[PDB]
């Protein structure tokens, strides 16, 4: 059984250097033709290939990132390290390392190369956020209005993830939509949480927001304005 | 470099359907192509290696064929765990490219979004910033287009949006879009509009308000 696992800092600041380690078990980077590669996935985006290294020590890199990547192996520790320099916000992504089989051998003679055509086992992935920001609690603002009515709370400018939002201390669940946060160009996150109700219920509505990282709890009652 | 284009980018289906996803390469990659399935929150999982070989432990409903520049993955009888995003990967040329992915989600009947526009709170305005949010609630299919207009000027580069994951009961999606402006710029205009295009809407719907109107 082959397993891989990524480790490194979850948070990194722009211009800094990011070092990611892939520790694995079940194979050796001294086994014939084996490879270990790195692939990343920005939130909501497609997979992007970064680099790979083989047991005979040949290395290859994405041409778009070549100047900022270094991949290396430590055979005796069963680890592969990928160093990315000068990171910027667009480098925020989940980073995965993965195993690549070498050709099948028969009495130590390569006879099948079809098994090298895939990365067959992947690590769970490690989430890395690139932002210059310091820990900071959100500002919470009201969002106020088939014949459904909508209202919500805008949880703005906080760092880092995550934040939790519930409605009426947990009693309001139907019609609730809490959207995934977006990382603003400022380096702070922002999210909305809304709830739809029969245009008659306008019943009281309060969003309970909690950002553990900064010890910031806020309950904000939201109503249909006009005094 | 080498381009790998997946089709379709998104696809709706129901349990029991037969689906086929295709991947085309800009130059021939021989048989060096792999398919993966990635479920939300998890790493991609190898399904098919070397264009058509079934990876060990992978269920037989998955099949891959093709070589050169055109490949296809077909799942013969879709199971609930197959609602996910699929990717193809080329390993003939460096860099070892991935396709853009194809999202497979629960089909349901078409539903237009209920649209709502929210002006910025007076509380936010006092801090000097103005956020205008637009909500597209419970729609299907997933593709939707939001266009902000301020006093009829088309906005660009000053909004951000996020979409919820498919609802497990509804099978619909919801989308939130935030237009951000300084309090000053905000004050220099009156009509804030959120224009929405979607398959379930005969023509674009616009929700708006005039700033300061009371």
């Amino acid at each position: 059984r082959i397993t891989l696992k990524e480790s490194g800092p979850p948070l990194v600041k722009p211009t800094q250097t990011l070092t990611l380690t892939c520790s694995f078990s079940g194979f050796s980077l001294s086994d014939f033709g084996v490879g270990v590669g790195w692939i990343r996935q920005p939130p909501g985006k497609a997979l992007e290939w970064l680099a790979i290294i083989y047991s005979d020590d040949d290395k290859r890199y994405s041409p778009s990132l070549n100047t900022r990547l270094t991949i290396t192996k430590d055979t005796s520790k069963n680890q592969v390290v990928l160093v990315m320099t000068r990171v910027s916000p667009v480098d925020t992504a989940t980073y995965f390392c993965a195993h690549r089989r070498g050709p099948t051998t028969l009495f130590g003679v390569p006879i099948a190369r079809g098994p090298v055509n895939a990365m067959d086992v992947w690590g769970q992935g490690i989430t890395v956020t690139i932002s210059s920001t310091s820990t900071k609690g959100p500002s919470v603002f009201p969002l106020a209005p088939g014949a459904a009515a909508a209202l919500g709370c805008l949880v703005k400018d906080y760092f880092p993830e995550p934040v939790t939002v519930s409605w009426n201390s947990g009693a309001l669940t139907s019609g609730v939509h809490t959207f995934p946060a977006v990382l603003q160009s400022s380096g702070l996150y922002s999210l909305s949480s809304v709830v739809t109700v029969p245009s008659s219920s306008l019943q009281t509505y309060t969003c309970n927001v909690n950002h553990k990282p900064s010890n910031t709890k806020v309950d904000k009652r939201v109503e249909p304005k006009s005094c | 470099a080498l381009q790998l284009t997946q089709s379709p980018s998104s696809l709706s289906a129901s349990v029991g359907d037969r689906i086929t996803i295709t991947c085309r390469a800009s130059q021939g990659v021989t048989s060096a192509l792999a398919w993966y399935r990635q479920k939300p929150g998890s790493p991609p999982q190898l399904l098919i290696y070397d264009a058509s070989s079934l990876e060990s432990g992978v269920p037989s409903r998955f099949s891959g064929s093709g070589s050169g520049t055109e490949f296809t993955l077909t799942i013969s009888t879709l199971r609930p765990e197959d609602f996910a995003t699929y990717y193809c990967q080329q390993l003939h040329f460096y860099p070892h490219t991935f396709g853009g992915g194809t999202r497979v989600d629960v089909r349901r009947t078409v539903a237009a979004p209920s649209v709502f526009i929210f002006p910025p709170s007076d509380e936010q305005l006092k801090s000097g910033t103005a956020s205008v949010v637009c909500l597209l609630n419970n729609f299907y299919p997933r593709e939707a287009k939001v266009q902000w207009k301020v006093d009829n000027a088309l906005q660009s580069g000053n909004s951000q949006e996020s979409v919820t994951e498919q609802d497990s009961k509804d099978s619909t999606y919801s989308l939130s879009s935030t237009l951000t402006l300084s309090k000053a710029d905000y004050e220099k205009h009156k009509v804030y509009e959120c224009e929405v295009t979607h398959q379930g809407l005969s023509s674009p719907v616009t929700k708006s308000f005039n700033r300061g109107e009371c």
């Binding site: 490879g35 083989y54 190369r113 090298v116 | 060096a32 390993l91 003939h92 040329f93 460096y94």
Partner: peptide
Amino acid sequence: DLDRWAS
């Protein structure tokens, strides 16, 4: 360039 096991 060609993958390590190409050609």
